[PDB]
Amino acid sequence: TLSLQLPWVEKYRPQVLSDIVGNKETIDRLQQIAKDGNMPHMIISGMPGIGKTTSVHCLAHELLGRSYADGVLELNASDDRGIDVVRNQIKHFAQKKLHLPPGKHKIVILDEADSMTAGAQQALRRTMELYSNSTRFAFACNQSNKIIEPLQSRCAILRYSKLSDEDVLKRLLQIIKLEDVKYTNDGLEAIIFTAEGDMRQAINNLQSTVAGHGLVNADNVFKIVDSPHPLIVKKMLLASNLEDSIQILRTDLWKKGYSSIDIVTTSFRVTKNLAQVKESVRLEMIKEIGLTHMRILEGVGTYLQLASMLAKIHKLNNKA
Amino acid sequence: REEDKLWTVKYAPTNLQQVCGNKGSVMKLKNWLANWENSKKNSFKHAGKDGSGVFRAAMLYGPPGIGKTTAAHLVAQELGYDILEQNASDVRSKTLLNAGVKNALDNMSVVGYFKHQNLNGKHFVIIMDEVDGMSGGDRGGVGQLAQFCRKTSTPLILICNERNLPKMRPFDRVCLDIQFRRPDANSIKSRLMTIAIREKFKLDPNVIDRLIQTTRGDIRQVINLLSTISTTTKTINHENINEISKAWEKNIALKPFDIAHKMLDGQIYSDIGSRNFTLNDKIALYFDDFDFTPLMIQENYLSTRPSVLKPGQSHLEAVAEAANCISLGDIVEKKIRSSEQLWSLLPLHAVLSSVYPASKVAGHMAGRINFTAWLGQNSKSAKYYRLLQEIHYHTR
Amino acid sequence: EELQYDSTLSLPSSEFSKIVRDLSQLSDSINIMITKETIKFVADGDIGSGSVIIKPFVDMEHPETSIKLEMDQPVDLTFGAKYLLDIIKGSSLSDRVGIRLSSEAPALFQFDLKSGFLQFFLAPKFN
Amino acid sequence: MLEAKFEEASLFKRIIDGFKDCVQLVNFQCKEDGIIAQAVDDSRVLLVSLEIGVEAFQEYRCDHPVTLGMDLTSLSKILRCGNNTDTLTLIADNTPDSIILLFEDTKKDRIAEYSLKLMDIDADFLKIEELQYDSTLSLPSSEFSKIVRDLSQLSDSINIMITKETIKFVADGDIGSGSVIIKPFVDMEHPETSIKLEMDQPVDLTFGAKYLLDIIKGSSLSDRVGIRLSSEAPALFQFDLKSGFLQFFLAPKF
Amino acid sequence: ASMLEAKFEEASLFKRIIDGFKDCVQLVNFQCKEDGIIAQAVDDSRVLLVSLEIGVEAFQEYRCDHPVTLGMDLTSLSKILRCGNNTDTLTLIADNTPDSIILLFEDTKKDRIAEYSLKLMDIDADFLKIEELQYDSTLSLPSSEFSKIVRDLSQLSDSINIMITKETIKFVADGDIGSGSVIIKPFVDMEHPETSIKLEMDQPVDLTFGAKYLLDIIKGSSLSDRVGIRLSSEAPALFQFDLKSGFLQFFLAPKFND
Amino acid sequence: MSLWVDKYRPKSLNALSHNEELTNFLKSLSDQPRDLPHLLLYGPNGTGKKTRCMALLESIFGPGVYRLKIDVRQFVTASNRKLELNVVSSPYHLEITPSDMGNNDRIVIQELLKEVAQMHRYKCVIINEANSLTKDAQAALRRTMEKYSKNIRLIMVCDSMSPIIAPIKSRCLLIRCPAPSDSEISTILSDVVTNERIQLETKDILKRIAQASNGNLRVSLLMLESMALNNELALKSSSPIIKPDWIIVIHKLTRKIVKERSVNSLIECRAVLYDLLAHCIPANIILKELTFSLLDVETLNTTNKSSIIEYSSVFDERLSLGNKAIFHLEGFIAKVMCCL
DNA sequence: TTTATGTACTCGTAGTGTCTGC
DNA sequence: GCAGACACTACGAGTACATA
Numbered sequence A: 001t002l003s004l005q006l007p008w009v010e011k012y013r014p015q016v017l018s019d020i021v022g023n024k025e026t027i028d029r030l031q032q033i034a035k036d037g038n039m040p041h042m043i044i045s046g047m048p049g050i051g052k053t054t055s056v057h058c059l060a061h062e063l064l065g066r067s068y069a070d071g072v073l074e075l076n077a078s079d080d081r082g083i084d085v086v087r088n089q090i091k092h093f094a095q096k097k098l099h100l101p102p103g104k105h106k107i108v109i110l111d112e113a114d115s116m117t118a119g120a121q122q123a124l125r126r127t128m129e130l131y132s133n134s135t136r137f138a139f140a141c142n143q144s145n146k147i148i149e150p151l152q153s154r155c156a157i158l159r160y161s162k163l164s165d166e167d168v169l170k171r172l173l174q175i176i177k178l179e180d181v182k183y184t185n186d187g188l189e190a191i192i193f194t195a196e197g198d199m200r201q202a203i204n205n206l207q208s209t210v211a212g213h214g215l216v217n218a219d220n221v222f223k224i225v226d227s228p229h230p231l232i233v234k235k236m237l238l239a240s241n242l243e244d245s246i247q248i249l250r251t252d253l254w255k256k257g258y259s260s261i262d263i264v265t266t267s268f269r270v271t272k273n274l275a276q277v278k279e280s281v282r283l284e285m286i287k288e289i290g291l292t293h294m295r296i297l298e299g300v301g302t303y304l305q306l307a308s309m310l311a312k313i314h315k316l317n318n319k320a
Numbered sequence B: 001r002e003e004d005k006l007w008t009v010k011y012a013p014t015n016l017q018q019v020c021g022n023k024g025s026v027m028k029l030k031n032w033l034a035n036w037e038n039s040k041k042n043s044f045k046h047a048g049k050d051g052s053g054v055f056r057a058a059m060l061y062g063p064p065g066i067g068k069t070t071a072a073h074l075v076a077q078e079l080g081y082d083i084l085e086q087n088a089s090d091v092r093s094k095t096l097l098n099a100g101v102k103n104a105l106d107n108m109s110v111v112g113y114f115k116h117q118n119l120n121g122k123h124f125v126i127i128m129d130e131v132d133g134m135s136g137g138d139r140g141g142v143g144q145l146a147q148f149c150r151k152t153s154t155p156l157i158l159i160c161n162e163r164n165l166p167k168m169r170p171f172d173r174v175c176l177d178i179q180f181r182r183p184d185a186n187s188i189k190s191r192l193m194t195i196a197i198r199e200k201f202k203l204d205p206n207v208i209d210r211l212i213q214t215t216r217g218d219i220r221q222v223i224n225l226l227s228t229i230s231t232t233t234k235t236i237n238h239e240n241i242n243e244i245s246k247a248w249e250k251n252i253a254l255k256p257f258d259i260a261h262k263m264l265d266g267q268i269y270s271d272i273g274s275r276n277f278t279l280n281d282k283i284a285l286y287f288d289d290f291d292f293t294p295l296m297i298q299e300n301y302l303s304t305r306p307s308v309l310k311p312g313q314s315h316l317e318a319v320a321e322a323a324n325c326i327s328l329g330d331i332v333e334k335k336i337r338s339s340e341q342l343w344s345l346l347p348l349h350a351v352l353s354s355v356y357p358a359s360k361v362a363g364h365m366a367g368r369i370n371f372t373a374w375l376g377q378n379s380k381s382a383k384y385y386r387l388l389q390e391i392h393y394h395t396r
Numbered sequence C: 001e002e003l004q005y006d007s008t009l010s011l012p013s014s015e016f017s018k019i020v021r022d023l024s025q026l027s028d029s030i031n032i033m034i035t036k037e038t039i040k041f042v043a044d045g046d047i048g049s050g051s052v053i054i055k056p057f058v059d060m061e062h063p064e065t066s067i068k069l070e071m072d073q074p075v076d077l078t079f080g081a082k083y084l085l086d087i088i089k090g091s092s093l094s095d096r097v098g099i100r101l102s103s104e105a106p107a108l109f110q111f112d113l114k115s116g117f118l119q120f121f122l123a124p125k126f127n
Numbered sequence D: 001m002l003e004a005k006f007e008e009a010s011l012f013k014r015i016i017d018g019f020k021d022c023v024q025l026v027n028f029q030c031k032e033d034g035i036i037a038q039a040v041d042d043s044r045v046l047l048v049s050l051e052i053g054v055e056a057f058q059e060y061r062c063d064h065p066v067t068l069g070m071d072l073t074s075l076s077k078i079l080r081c082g083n084n085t086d087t088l089t090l091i092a093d094n095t096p097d098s099i100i101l102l103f104e105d106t107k108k109d110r111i112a113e114y115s116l117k118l119m120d121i122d123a124d125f126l127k128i129e130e131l132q133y134d135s136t137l138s139l140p141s142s143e144f145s146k147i148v149r150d151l152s153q154l155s156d157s158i159n160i161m162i163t164k165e166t167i168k169f170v171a172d173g174d175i176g177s178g179s180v181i182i183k184p185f186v187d188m189e190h191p192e193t194s195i196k197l198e199m200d201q202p203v204d205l206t207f208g209a210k211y212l213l214d215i216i217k218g219s220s221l222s223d224r225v226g227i228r229l230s231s232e233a234p235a236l237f238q239f240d241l242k243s244g245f246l247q248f249f250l251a252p253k254f
Numbered sequence E: 001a002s003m004l005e006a007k008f009e010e011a012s013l014f015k016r017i018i019d020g021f022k023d024c025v026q027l028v029n030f031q032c033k034e035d036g037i038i039a040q041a042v043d044d045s046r047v048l049l050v051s052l053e054i055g056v057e058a059f060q061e062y063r064c065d066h067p068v069t070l071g072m073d074l075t076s077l078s079k080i081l082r083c084g085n086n087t088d089t090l091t092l093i094a095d096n097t098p099d100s101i102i103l104l105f106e107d108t109k110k111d112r113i114a115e116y117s118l119k120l121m122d123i124d125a126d127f128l129k130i131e132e133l134q135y136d137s138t139l140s141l142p143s144s145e146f147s148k149i150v151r152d153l154s155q156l157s158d159s160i161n162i163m164i165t166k167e168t169i170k171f172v173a174d175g176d177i178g179s180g181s182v183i184i185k186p187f188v189d190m191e192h193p194e195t196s197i198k199l200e201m202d203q204p205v206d207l208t209f210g211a212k213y214l215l216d217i218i219k220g221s222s223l224s225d226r227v228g229i230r231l232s233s234e235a236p237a238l239f240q241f242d243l244k245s246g247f248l249q250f251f252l253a254p255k256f257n258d
Numbered sequence F: 001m002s003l004w005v006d007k008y009r010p011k012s013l014n015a016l017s018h019n020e021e022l023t024n025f026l027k028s029l030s031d032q033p034r035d036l037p038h039l040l041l042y043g044p045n046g047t048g049k050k051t052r053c054m055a056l057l058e059s060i061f062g063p064g065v066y067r068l069k070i071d072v073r074q075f076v077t078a079s080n081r082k083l084e085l086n087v088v089s090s091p092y093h094l095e096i097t098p099s100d101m102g103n104n105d106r107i108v109i110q111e112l113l114k115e116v117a118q119m120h121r122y123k124c125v126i127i128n129e130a131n132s133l134t135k136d137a138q139a140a141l142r143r144t145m146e147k148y149s150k151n152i153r154l155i156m157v158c159d160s161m162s163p164i165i166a167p168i169k170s171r172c173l174l175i176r177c178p179a180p181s182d183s184e185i186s187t188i189l190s191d192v193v194t195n196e197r198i199q200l201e202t203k204d205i206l207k208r209i210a211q212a213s214n215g216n217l218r219v220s221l222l223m224l225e226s227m228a229l230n231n232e233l234a235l236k237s238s239s240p241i242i243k244p245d246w247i248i249v250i251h252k253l254t255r256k257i258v259k260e261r262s263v264n265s266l267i268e269c270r271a272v273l274y275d276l277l278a279h280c281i282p283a284n285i286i287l288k289e290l291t292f293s294l295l296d297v298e299t300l301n302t303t304n305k306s307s308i309i310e311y312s313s314v315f316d317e318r319l320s321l322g323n324k325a326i327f328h329l330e331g332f333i334a335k336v337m338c339c340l
Numbered sequence G: 001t002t003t004a005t006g007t008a009c010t011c012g013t014a015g016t017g018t019c020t021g022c
Numbered sequence H: 001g002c003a004g005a006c007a008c009t010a011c012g013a014g015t016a017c018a019t020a
């Protein structure tokens, strides 16, 4: 069995708060907390892959360089995050006597706290209210709606935002300077367009393209990763001249092996997030796509159901 | 060791006049807790105008971060009583509550002996925080707490968030009903002026109203917000107030009345309203209370004066159009809650039951939002059914 | 602080544990009574009512199995069940337990060790 | 007017331990000749009847028959309080809404008196059907308990078949099958452990595993269990006592 | 005549072997040949392997004409083994192309022969032979002592680090609530040779193991009074429990270190 | 019993003179009980399908089939939800109805047929109101009735057998029971009034009962009893026709919809509909009666009638595919008022 | 009093096995 | 040696959520 090279996702994982590129105000605030020391309870939320847990880990490393292995607790959904284990472990950690530097506090990191049970969060509320001058919590969830209201009340909400293409380009050029590779600007633009703000997706696509071909060119990138289905579905829905939408479907979704359920769900999401057309036409289109979704889920999954959904959408578009 | 504690604990109310806002609730609670002795010797039968004599226990409810715990603790400490605080971190099921503070309800403290003039230093006050955190329901401790309210020889204080839970029903009138509200802007303004003086950060007297209204009166998050802002930039003015507001909006889950009230507004469905309040926002608004929203739309989808009528379309035609989609979404709800349990149709049910029917009858209202009446008539219909099968069994 | 109690009862820890575990299977409360040189461990509950009466004596064969009591003032004290079970959980340290009862003071359940003691302070309920 | 002073509370303790789970509510129709009781389970398929004569009691005096509706969990707690060397004294009044269980020890060091109220439980219908049983066997209770437990591990329906002096407890399930046969062994040095059978006519009866496991809890009463079967009458598992006996009536379930 | 006829003296034996790896393994198979009834199975998590061999010496009378494979569910088999007494004698009976075996519980003290049948199963796991023969450290310590050490160190943490030095055996179990360090040195007890501990150190060994699987290993300490651990880097640990005719050797994969 | 509908009931096929061809077919079935297929009697409600079933059972098994014993049974469902349904058992046969909760009747019908299937030779099973079974329950019943045939036989009673699934209709012998004619209702009511004591002078009142019942023997008998006790056992030629309160309020709602078309009228209609649904009337019959009362108004034009019946069909389909039963009726009324 | 399977969590429960000491 | 006393895994029953 051959050995495996470390993936570029964590082979170039940042270790300093200056390495991560993104929301400049957020990173400056994190650096200020790093220099000062008095870290408040924070709830970091945002889209996947935009550098949430890496910032928390870098901040904890900078704050507890010498006592990271002793005064930092890391829990996630992979651990038994239930009321008994949360109670016992968090209360044992929050009362443990560890002589940190005067500005440094214990940090309890809870990755992906969105999937955490309500009673465990209720216990965490009381634990945070008791032990706050010795330990400081730190959540990192994709959506902050799952976390109960009192936990957000006693924390400091800090939301991330999707990275602009400039920051993804800067990081990609930094990694390309770190490891030698031949690239074309068209290939990098294609990778950035495919990533859609997801830095981890960009790194995975770049690594896959380099391993598959060795040259980061537009054709190689489009061979490794296909065009995203939301874009082709949006092109299908927005286009008039029903025959054109029918052939777009039959060419780019049916013969490319996309399941009918996936096409219908993607159409629902696209027409929900669509902004070019007015509200009433979006509502009708959602109604028709939902009727087709009901038909598909009942079991009648064929090309003709999708064609009929497109036909009803186009009859709506031409205003009968 | 100072300058490491949170700003929400070092700047905490020490005495009763430092609790900004809700002075009436605090003074009522103190009056109730100060006259429980004579009421106990009166066998909880005779009460004054306020009724504190006949209320053996008092419970506290309201939005977070307004001072329920702090005011309760200060009142308990000031009058010489010995605090006994409980929580959801300690399991309070039937077994652990019957073997918990059940013995301490009619028993006196031991620490009051060696801590002693104090006339109530040999008593207990039961401060049960996080009682909404106990989601046990049946055999989950709520009935045990009802029994405790019925029979306790010591003051009993409960702290929760809001009362509209069906779990919270058994405390309809057995417990006192003191309630806290959002504190006024003047008291918070004075408190934050003192905080700004203490922490030498610039705080304009006019940005504070926006800081309060973004946080919805949650004082603790306000203090945390000023702390985290002043970490890197201790001066705030009109320049950064919009960025601070958009970055630290509270984003409360809306109350079942509030989802219907926001959804029936005609402003959000206009061309400007659609851009500011997108369709995804309406879907999230439905999913805030996806259980009660489809009904709550339906009971009052026709009691609104329309403002989004198409030219040539009467109000009754819009009501019929909304009713057709309510009927259509009924089928989707049935298919979701069936043997197959196709729960991927919930976003469909959003549009088919709340978005579209409210998109035709939007505008200013004839009256206040009417609660879902389908629940009560469904209960009465079920009782009528049970009676009919009963008399059908008897008649054969 | 050291204060004089109305009565001081000293009985073997095994016998005391047996009696209190016997009574705790009937009610959540025990009404300890010491009057007329007669310890009157009683308990009344929803299921029924229980009572145990013992007589202080001296055992020549084995003095550690005897009951010793001194009478200064009468007592009227009431205690819970789980608290007394937690107290007797440590009965293995000492053969005999020294219990002192006062009307307006906590009970002092004391287990003499070889070079120390484990004394419990349990507050009696309302009278 | 009832004074039933036992010589050892362990007898009553193992009796109630025998019928903890088969029934929860029982009406004690005590008489002059002793105490008899009849009880039916919730499923209306298992019938338990107990009988203890005066010969077991050191003293007994019951002038007026009184039907006592009494809980078994409370008795279990009160008799777990009891132990060896203590003589239980069952005492009742003329109108005993509450019962008295005096625990008298040899020494005056600690004498305990207890109480328990009497709930309202309707008098069960005293069916006295004693139809003759085709086959009769008696084997040690430990052997029968082991056999029924091991065969109930495999399946939930134990077949009992008697033919040619060879009882064949067969239980067939999903993980496999189980067949045990017993020859009519006779022992001289230890007559208590023996297998004797009176096969008048072959029978083939199937019983559920839950009730067959439940009836085992009376094994502490007797070292030997006598079983008599009929093709249509309910089976009779009888536990020998010093004075009387305790019996289980379970109808066949084909 | 049944082609497979294996007789057990002191039928509590086979129950002890079955209970040795009932908990860790749920599905096994028994390649019964003329040499003896061997077995080999891998857990669902593919971490721990259980090899087994029972020689002809352990059987009163053993006769196996052709190689037989008996894929089995260990839960049902252990339940069947529990359906008997240690006084009885157990016999495995299988015919040609077996669908199930026949287990007999006979005793001359009292004629109460009980015949149980357990359904077979098609595991279809060909596995492979053991290809590990060279080990750095070869140590043997009493089973009771090792089981006790594992038991009181599994409560502290989930990882038990076994370190081997020059005549020094160290168990480190650092965890959340504290740490642990059990240091045991070789010594030869002349009075009780069974309680002696032996060490044979070639190259230093530093391996960590999971607590739950090590508890599953020590669950077999009732099978034999002495266990011989044979550690080596880049090689699974070999916990061998000797039998009267064969052995019950386990293979445990050390956790990764990074 | 004091009611005249129940104790004036035929007990055998000879007493049944309502339909000669149906009685002849039932006698043909009853001649050879050995080879009896599974029956499924369908037709309009109230014509006496259960009477035919019981008469056939007596003609096959013999007497004593009317000695019904009310036996209670217990059931185990998901979670702690316990349902108690009493089975109306009898010698030689058994009766079962879906009186339990609609969503969970599959387990009940399943274990009843499995238990009775174990133990002339067969034991018939009658399932009243079979159109109310959920489709999964009928799917379970299919193989249950197909596997056991020598032991169990099903006489399945239902009106408007459309919800019955196709395989059940395939394995069930279908028997049609037409509604009573006016002459038959008049003859039966004449027999009842002759056997009883009512001062009747003109046959016109009996024919008016027959017209008002709409081929419903049970409703006609209830009407006769009601206005017989009202008229002091003396029917008058100008006696007003008494109608059930549900009919009266449905007609009142119809007049309210016709005379005014306003949103306040719509909320009042919502209140009335909630009251009627709480009064335990199935929504299908409510919609049918409301539609047939709307079409009887002479003020409405033919185009409005066509639109009303089209929307009525659409919302009847929605009611059959719905679970709230009030949203669909409200939508139907809104569409009707929009049309009007 | 509603949904109506499957999943996950939480609890108290009853057996089950192992260590102390009469 | 036997009976308890413990901690232990295991089973049963009930609440809660189910798309971003």
Ligand SMILES: Nc1ncnc2c1ncn2[C@@H]1O[C@H](COP(=O)(O)OP(=O)(O)OP(O)(O)=S)[C@@H](O)[C@H]1O
Pocket: A008, A009, A010, A012, A013, A014, A019, A020, A021, A022, A047, A048, A049, A050, A051, A052, A053, A054, A055, A141, A142, A171, A199, A200, A203
């Ligand atoms: N601002 C950034 N600067 C540099 N690398 C980044 C940045 N954001 C993300 N990355 C890269 O993304 C990877 C880390 O992503 P994560 O932070 O683990 O994703 P995440 O924010 O935790 O989102 P989820 O919810 O866990 S999927 C590493 O390969 C980083 O190099």
Ligand SMILES: Nc1ncnc2c1ncn2[C@@H]1O[C@H](COP(=O)(O)OP(=O)(O)OP(O)(O)=S)[C@@H](O)[C@H]1O
Pocket: A150, A153, A154, B007, B008, B009, B011, B012, B013, B018, B019, B020, B021, B063, B064, B065, B066, B067, B068, B069, B070, B071, B161, B183, B191, B219, B220, B223
């Ligand atoms: N009236 C007030 N004026 C100023 N600060 C206040 C006031 N009430 C609360 N606070 C701040 O909030 C902190 C704790 O408030 P709490 O009363 O514990 O919150 P809460 O009402 O219990 O809400 P929960 O328990 O999180 S739902 C105090 O230490 C203060 O920093």
Ligand SMILES: Nc1ncnc2c1ncn2[C@@H]1O[C@H](COP(=O)(O)OP(=O)(O)O)[C@@H](O)[C@H]1O
Pocket: F004, F005, F006, F008, F009, F010, F015, F016, F017, F018, F044, F045, F046, F047, F048, F049, F050, F051, F052, F188, F217, F218, F221
């Ligand atoms: N041949 C008949 N002669 C007189 N009355 C009849 C006859 N057939 C049916 N009936 C009447 O029908 C009524 C029973 O109807 P029922 O069986 O309840 O109808 P359904 O089966 O539709 O519910 C009885 O009151 C009975 O008087």
Ligand SMILES: [Mg+2]
Pocket: A052, A053, A111, A112, A140
């Ligand atoms: Mg993450």
Ligand SMILES: [Mg+2]
Pocket: B068, B069, B129, B130, B159
């Ligand atoms: Mg609070």
